Design a protein around this ligand. Structure first.
Ligand SMILES: NC(=O)c1ccc[n+]([C@@H]2O[C@H](COP(=O)([O-])OP(=O)(O)OC[C@H]3O[C@@H](n4cnc5c(N)ncnc54)[C@H](OP(=O)(O)O)[C@@H]3O)[C@@H](O)[C@H]2O)c1
Ligand SMILES: NC(=O)c1ccc[n+]([C@@H]2O[C@H](COP(=O)([O-])OP(=O)(O)OC[C@H]3O[C@@H](n4cnc5c(N)ncnc54)[C@H](OP(=O)(O)O)[C@@H]3O)[C@@H](O)[C@H]2O)c1
Ligand code: NA
Lengths: 357, 359
C-alpha cells in the first residue's frame, strides 16, 4: 500500500481529510499527520490507532507516496516542492498552484483526464467553484455554456476553524447577552488577512478573501478563472458575487447560465440527475430543493430550483448546495487520490518543475 | 390634524409603523390601533399615551382619515374597501391590491406622480422590490434598463413576528442545547401557509411565499411584476431567486443589471449617491460595503460592490441592503402618507372601485 501524509491535519479541512481517508478504499500502509511546530508531539486518531503529529519541514517527506496539503498557501508554497523532490504526489487544497500551467486543476467527474500528465502536484479548486462545476458539466456536455452569473451563500467553515468559533461566540453574545449585532467585536471575518473585521452574526458579508484591482474579490475571480481552466474553455463568461452568511457548514449558490443551444428543462433535470456526484433534489410541488443543513455530511452536490429564465431564451436558473469541507475540499482531494491510484499515477516525478523556496 | 388607524398594530410591521408615525411630521389628532380578536382589549403605547387595541370590523373606520394596513392579504381584501367607502385613504402593505389598475403602486422617490389619481387605496410594493427600485431608478433615468437578475438574502422578519421568534428559538437550541440543525422542529418557515416547514437556523431556504405554476415562487414573480408597474415599463426583463437566510432584520440583494447604454461605474456611483433615499457605501480599499447589521434602524437604502460585468459591456453588479420593516414596509407607508399630505391628497374618494366582500 501507500504511505499517506496529511499536512494541516489539525485544521477544519484536515479533520475532514482524516474522516475521508478513514472511509476511503485507498490501500494505506502508513499514515502520518503533519502540522506546525505547536502541534508537534500531540496525538490524533486514525480509526482506532494513535498517530503522533509531526512538524512540517523540508526533510519530512521521505518515504511518502501521497501528501494531502491543507495548511494555507504559505505552507504549500514552501514545502510542496520539497515533497515532489522526495518522490511524493501532492494533492493541494490551497490556491497557490491552481493557475500554474504545469499543475492540473481537477474535479474528478469533470476533468480526470488532466491527471494523466501531472508533474507531482494536483490542485484542488476552490470549494465554491467545485460544486458549481459538478452541477454545470452535464449541462455543458449536451447544450454548451455561453455565460455564468453566480451569487454565493457561503458557510463560515470556509474561512477555517477560527471563523466557526468566532461565528458561534458572536451569535451567543447576541442571543444570550443581548448585544446588538452591529456592536459585536470581530477578529477574523470577512478575511483574516485583511485590515478590518466585521461581525457575521445576523449579517451577510459581501466579501470573501481580499479585493483585487478590478473591485472583485479574489474569491469571485477564482470562480471565474478556475471555471475556465477546469472546463478548458476561456470563452465561457463568468462573473460572481461571493457572500458570507451565518451558516457553519455547506455552501449554497444561486446560479444563472445561458447555454449555446436551448436546453429543455426536463432534459436538464435528467442530465444533472444522471451525472456522477450530482443529485437532483427538485420537486417544488412537495417543496423539495437543496438545503445547506441536509447537505452537511454528504459527498454529493445537490441541485434544484431548476427553471428557465422568464425572458432569455437560453437562460436557466438553479440552486446548488454542497458541503464545503467535503466535495468542496477533503472529499475532492481523497477522490483525486483514489483516481490517481486507479490510473497508476501514484509514482515519483523525474522532472522537477517547481522551484525550491 | 388627521385621525390615523394602524391595522395590524401588534405585528412585526405594525410595531415599526408605530415607531415611524411617532417620528413623523404628520399632524395626528387621533391614533387608533386595530388588529384581530386575539389582540382586542390589549394596550399599546403611542409615545406616552395608552391606546386600547380594537378588533378590525367593516364598521371600524368611521371618522378615520388615513388607514395603514399591514395585517395580511385577507384582512386588506375584507376591510380596505369598507374603509374607502367610509371616506378613508388606505395605504396597504399587502400584495392584494398591488396589481390592480385602479391602485397606485408607489415608492415615493420613484413614482410619487402616480399618487395624484388614487382611488382611495395606495399599495406599498413587496419589501424586496422597494429597495431594488431605490437603487436602480437613478441608473434607469440616465442609462435605461434592459434586464435585471436578482438573488436575494432575505431576513426572517419578512415572514412576521412568529418567524422572528422561531428563528431565535432554533438558534438558541443549537448554540445552547447542542441540538443538530437537522433535528430542529419548524412550524412557520419557509412559508406559514404552505404544507411543509423547515429549519432556518444555519440554513438557506430558496423558498419565500408559495410556488406558482411556472416553478418560480410568488415572491420571485412579485419582484418581476411589481418592477414593471413601478417603473412603468413592461419591457424590462426581470428574473429573481428569493432566499431566506438566518438574519432577523434587513434584506440584502445581489443585483445584476444590463443598461440600454454603457453606464460608467464612477458615474453610476455618483448617480446613486445623489438619489433621494439611496446612500452610497462603496469604498473597497477600506472594505466599505452595505451590511444588513448596519442598515437596521435606518430609513435609507444602501448600495455598494458596484462594478461592471467581466464580459457584458452594459452589465453591472451591485449589492443592495435595506431594513425590510422600514423602507421595505413601515417607512415606505409613512412616507406615502406624508407625500399624500404634501399634495393635499388625504380626502374621501367619491366613486367606489373596489368590491365589498362582507355584504
Ligand atoms: N475551509 C474550507 O471550506 C476550504 C475549502 C477549500 C480549500 N480550503 C483551503 O485549505 C486550507 C486550510 O483551510 P482550513 O479551513 O483547514 O484552515 P484552518 O482551520 O485554519 O487550519 C489550518 C491548518 O494549517 C496548519 N498550519 C498552519 N501553519 C502551518 C505551517 N507553517 N506548517 C504546517 N502546518 C501549518 C495548522 O496547523 P496548527 O494547528 O499546528 O497551527 C492547521 O491544521 C486553506 O488554504 C484554504 O484556502 C479550505
Ligand atoms: N414583514 C415584512 O418585512 C413585510 C414587508 C412588506 C409587507 N409585509 C406585509 O405585511 C403584512 C403583515 O406584516 P407582518 O410581517 O408584521 O406580520 P405579523 O407579524 O405576523 O403580524 C400580522 C398582523 O396582522 C394582524 N391580523 C391577523 N389577522 C387579522 C384579522 N383577521 N383582522 C385584523 N388583523 C389581523 C395581527 O393581529 P393579532 O396580533 O391580533 O393577531 C398582526 O398584528 C403581510 O401581509 C405582509 O405581506 C410585510
Ligand atoms: Na447523479
Amino acid at each position: 500500500g501507500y504511505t499517506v501524509a496529511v499536512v494541516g491535519a489539525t485544521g477544519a479541512v484536515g479533520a475532514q481529510m482524516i474522516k475521508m481517508l478513514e472511509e476511503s478504499t485507498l490501500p494505506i500502509d502508513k499514515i502520518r499527520y503533519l502540522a506546525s511546530a505547536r502541534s508537534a508531539g500531540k496525538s490524533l486518531k486514525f480509526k482506532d490507532q494513535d498517530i503522533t503529529i509531526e512538524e512540517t519541514t523540508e526533510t519530512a517527506f521521505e518515504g511518502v507516496d501521497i501528501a494531502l496539503f491543507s495548511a494555507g498557501s504559505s505552507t504549500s508554497a514552501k514545502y510542496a516542492p520539497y515533497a515532489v523532490k522526495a518522490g511524493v504526489v501532492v494533492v493541494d487544497n490551497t490556491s497557490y498552484f491552481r493557475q500554474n500551467p504545469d499543475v492540473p486543476l481537477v474535479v474528478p467527474e469533470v476533468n480526470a483526464h488532466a491527471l494523466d500528465a501531472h508533474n507531482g502536484i494536483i490542485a484542488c479548486p476552490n470549494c465554491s467553484t467545485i460544486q458549481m462545476m459538478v452541477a454545470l458539466e452535464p449541462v455543458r456536455q449536451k447544450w454548451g455554456l455561453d455565460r455564468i452569473i453566480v451569487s454565493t451563500y457561503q458557510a463560515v467553515s470556509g474561512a477555517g476553524m477560527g471563523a466557526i468559533l468566532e461565528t458561534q461566540r458572536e451569535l451567543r453574545e447576541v442571543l444570550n447577552d443581548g448585544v446588538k449585532p452591529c456592536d459585536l467585536h470581530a477578529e477574523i471575518l470577512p478575511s483574516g488577512g485583511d485590515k478590518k473585521h466585521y461581525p457575521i452574526a445576523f449579517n451577510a458579508l459581501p466579501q470573501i478573501d481580499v479585493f483585487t484591482d478590478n473591485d472583485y474579490t479574489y474569491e469571485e475571480m477564482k470562480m471565474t478563472k478556475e471555471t475556465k481552466k477546469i472546463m478548458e474553455d476561456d470563452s465561457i463568461a463568468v462573473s460572481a458575487t461571493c457572500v458570507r452568511i451565518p451558516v457553519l457548514s455547506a455552501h449554497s449558490e444561486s446560479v444563472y447560465i445561458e447555454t449555446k443551444e436551448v436546453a429543455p428543462i426536463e432534459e436538464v433535470k435528467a442530465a444533472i440527475a444522471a451525472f456522477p456526484g450530482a443529485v437532483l433534489e427538485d420537486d417544488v410541488a412537495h417543496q423539495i430543493y437543496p438545503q445547506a443543513i441536509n447537505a452537511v455530511g454528504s459527498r454529493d452536490t445537490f441541485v434544484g430550483r431548476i427553471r428557465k429564465d422568464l425572458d432569455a431564451e437560453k437562460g436557466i436558473h438553479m440552486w446548488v448546495v454542497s458541503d464545503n469541507l467535503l466535495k468542496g475540499a477533503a472529499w475532492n482531494s481523497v477522490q483525486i487520490a483514489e483516481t490517481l491510484h486507479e490510473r497508476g499515477l501514484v509514482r515519483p516525478t523525474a522532472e522537477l518543475k517547481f522551484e525550491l523556496k
